[PDB]
Design a protein around this ligand. Structure first.
Ligand SMILES: C=C=CCNCCCC/N=C/C=C(\C)N1c2cc(C)c(C)cc2N(C[C@H](O)[C@H](O)[C@H](O)COP(=O)(O)OP(=O)(O)OC[C@H]2O[C@@H](n3cnc4c(N)ncnc43)[C@H](O)[C@@H]2O)c2[nH]c(=O)[nH]c(=O)c21
Ligand SMILES: C=C=CCNCCCC/N=C/C=C(\C)N1c2cc(C)c(C)cc2N(C[C@H](O)[C@H](O)[C@H](O)COP(=O)(O)OP(=O)(O)OC[C@H]2O[C@@H](n3cnc4c(N)ncnc43)[C@H](O)[C@@H]2O)c2[nH]c(=O)[nH]c(=O)c21
Ligand SMILES: [Cl-]
Ligand SMILES: [Cl-]
Ligand SMILES: [Cl-]
Ligand SMILES: [Cl-]
Lengths: 442, 442
């Protein structure tokens, strides 16, 4: 009864692939989702009336962006200053920050002009910071205390740059509404929840592919679209494919990077922050000399660059939204809500110079790195890798027996929701063209 | 190329089944063993020259016993008093122990005569102890202190009875020598080590059975002989069979018992025990009133009835051999060698009344309950179950697609090495008869 297609993952890529096939008259389609939910790294949570994003937060502008189009078409779509604080409870003056910002931006451009691959982009940052460090050290007119603060702001910027990897729209109702739109069309029977896959068996001798589920169910199939993260692949490629993947694809899985980026929300009964403060930015004065990329686990909290104040209060309450990227996010994920809440409260006391700040009423946080269905937040082309690795990863296996979809497999829109969606449509489109060729040949 | 037979487990049952098939001209035979070793619950360890059994220790006499025959044919086969000590470092006099022993044996026989199923055997113990407790309490001539000791000896006996479940020969070279004899004949390629099975798939549409390995290898087969313990079945039957087992067999798996019985060996530099002492038997004076079947985890050590002195010293060194049965053995298995060694040393100080006993030089111990390939030491017909459950467990699935072997599936020799061996030959014999019928019919 037609070709049997199995999609692994009910994130944007898996749902987009499933929908595209169903719309082109593929009846025998089943989505195997590991978790109890759809959307994957799109995860919207409601604390009372308020809606908080634990994954994807922003749509990256654009009319061509098919997630903007989805949202706008269904009508889902829609202050003050960054307060820089020192670890001895002092605010850094406007003029110091503004002076640093301009020095950094001037030196970043003189560097970026001098250089556009992965190793190029990274080295702009590295040589910018060392030149900025020189210009501060060698400035004859700045006093000692001011130089120590500005040098520590290099380390604060470095932490902000560590989370960065791509004008910007939010969905106040929840990013999960966009996910629910894609899934509307899909019949109920198609999406199997709580159904993690253990291994894909290909080059077999009615069904040349067998999907081995964790619950030991064997599902024969003609084609499999794999949408699991680069994190899942890195951890499981050795056991997840029989026979082994082509060595080019194994190399791609090794060379491409995936970052753990977790969100920390702190709900307070009353606010303790000035009405001029959009954010609290944490500058540790003892980090003037350090070039620290990864902190030891005891100092995981130091990788938090600061906290944004959510606006408006009536929508969200009095909530601080922090980000933590890298191995320090994995350490954070191992700690209890009380242990995390306590350390963030301690930090905010030290940085505000106000020892009477109460522990937050509630705490909400993501755990993407430790989750065996994600093992990270988003992909990037790493200091070593290229766009060739993304093409290698995306490349189907012989017979289109296994196709590779997901954000990581998208050449220009990797680490985005639209990248995921479009990577799904690409692989669905690949099958459609293959079965058009059989129609045209015969 | 002939019928494809897969044996799960390279214990006595699996090896016996494999050998029997190979000897009757079954060429296409493979044994999948989870662990890196053969023998299963036969496990011999050498500390220097000495050989210590962590599993099966004794051959239960007999000429008909095929393990006696195996040993004797290859020439592998071959003091003092039990010292009863109180928890206040006092030895219980010969006459007190002898008086208790006779009271127990007299009252056990008067009860056993009055009653022979599982619920019958257990109830003999229960009504014996309560009658003994009465006869002690109501004895007009015994003093108070003596009654408290004798009543606490009921609890010490109760612990010894908790490990009991079946004249007696040892193999000084190692019980593993008997295992190695069976395996001699078996070609190298047949036994796959480090190869745990995850699920057996039966009622399929060239190979009506698929064995799903933990490493995700799918092995087509005509017949599967399952030799894993009742412990493994109890824990994994829900996931280990597709489709589900007959409800009669599920009920049998539930109703039949498997006990965790672990061995503790303590090697001392010098002995601290009298040359008259074969064993140190631990009587806790505060257990006069208790009828405790299972201790809380904090008091796991109380389930140790005492320690045997191994003889002769030149063979073994100065070693104490203790046994611990039940949930208290699972608690023991979670503790470190230092933590276990320390508590046993503390006990021996309290019970000898000698506070200067050094911590043992070495410690050796089994961990059958926590081991996912055993989850217990041996089967028994439980207070509720019958020999009908053993027949239900032993019963093959339709087509002899799956056969059930192992100690637990043997009607009279369950919980023994010969039971395991003979249960293997039974299932091998079952296949041989099935393929003799096809030879005679056609
Ligand atoms: C002043 C000032 C400061 C402000 N600075 C401005 C800078 C802002 C720059 N933007 C940042 C954006 C972030 C951080 N954004 C962000 C933040 C965070 C915290 C995250 C986690 C992500 C993001 N991204 C990336 C996307 O979320 C991601 O690419 C896609 O959802 C993935 O889709 P998929 O490929 O289908 O995989 P999926 O994993 O979703 O689905 C696969 C499924 O497979 C399942 N699975 C796994 N194993 C399985 C198995 N064995 N068997 C069966 N199933 C299995 C699994 O359960 C899943 O359901 C963002 N994207 C975007 O558009 N906007 C954004 O803001 C962000
Ligand atoms: C004065 C005074 C005091 C003295 N008192 C005297 C009283 C003495 C009474 N006797 C007591 C005897 C004991 C306690 N004895 C004793 C003590 C102790 C500590 C133990 C642990 C046992 C015993 N017994 C029982 C036997 O050891 C047991 O029945 C068989 O070896 C099991 O064989 P099998 O069926 O093949 O299973 P196996 O489990 O061996 O093999 C199955 C294989 O399957 C493998 N497997 C599991 N899962 C798998 C998967 N998923 N995939 C693939 N493979 C997988 C696994 O790794 C194994 O290798 C004894 N027997 C005996 O004859 N003499 C004895 O003394 C004792
Ligand atoms: Cl199945
Ligand atoms: Cl990482
Ligand atoms: Cl395979
Ligand atoms: Cl138990």
């Amino acid at each position: 009864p037609g070709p049997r297609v199995v999609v692994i993952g009910a994130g944007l890529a898996g749902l987009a692939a499933a929908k595209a096939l169903l719309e082109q008259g593929f009846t025998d389609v089943t989505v195997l989702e590991a978790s109890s939910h759809i959307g994957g790294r799109v995860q919207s949570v409601k604390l009372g009336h308020a809606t908080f994003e634990l994954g994807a937060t922003w749509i990256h502008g654009s009319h061509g962006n098919p997630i903007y189009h989805l949202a706008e078409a269904n009508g889902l779509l829609e202050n003050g200053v960054a307060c820089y604080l020192t670890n001895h409870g002092r605010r850094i003056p406007k003029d110091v920050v503004e002076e640093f910002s301009d020095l950094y931006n001037e030196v970043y451009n003189l560097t970026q002009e001098f250089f556009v691959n992965a190793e190029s982009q990274n080295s702009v940052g590295v040589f910018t910071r060392e030149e900025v460090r020189n210009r501060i050290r060698n400035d004859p007119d700045d006093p000692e205390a001011t130089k120590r603060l500005k040098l520590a702001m290099i380390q604060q910027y470095l932490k902000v740059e560590s989370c960065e990897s791509s004008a910007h729209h939010i969905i106040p109702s929840g990013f999960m509404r966009v996910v629910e739109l894609l899934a509307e069309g899909i019949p109920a029977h198609v999406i199997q929840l709580g159904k993690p896959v253990r291994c894909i068996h290909w080059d077999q001798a009615s069904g040349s592919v067998v999907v081995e589920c964790e619950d030991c169910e064997l599902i024969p199939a003609d084609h499999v679209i794999v949408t699991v993260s680069l994190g899942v692949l890195k951890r499981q490629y050795t056991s997840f494919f029989r026979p082994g993947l082509p060595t080019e694809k194994v190399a791609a899985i090794h060379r491409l990077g995936i970052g753990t980026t977790d969100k920390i929300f702190l709900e307070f009964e009353e606010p303790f922050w000035g009405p001029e403060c959009n954010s609290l930015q944490f500058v540790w004065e003892d980090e003037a000399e350090s070039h620290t990329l990864t902190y030891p686990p005891e100092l995981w909290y130091r990788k938090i660059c600061g906290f944004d104040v959510l606006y408006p209060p009536e929508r969200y309450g009095h909530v601080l939204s922090g980000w933590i990227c890298g191995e320090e996010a994995l350490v954070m994920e191992t700690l209890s809500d009380e242990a995390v809440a306590e350390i963030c409260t301690e930090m905010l006391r030290q940085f505000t110079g106000n020892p009477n700040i109460p522990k937050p009423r509630r705490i909400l946080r993501s755990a993407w790195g430790s989750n065996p269905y994600f093992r990270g937040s988003y992909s990037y082309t790493q200091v070593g890798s290229s766009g060739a690795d993304v093409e290698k990863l995306a490349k189907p296996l012989p017979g289109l027996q296994v196709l590779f979809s997901g954000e990581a497999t998208h050449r220009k829109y990797y680490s985005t929701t639209h990248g995921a969606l479009l990577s799904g449509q690409r692989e669905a489109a690949r099958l459609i063209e293959m079965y058009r060729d059989l129609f045209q040949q015969s």
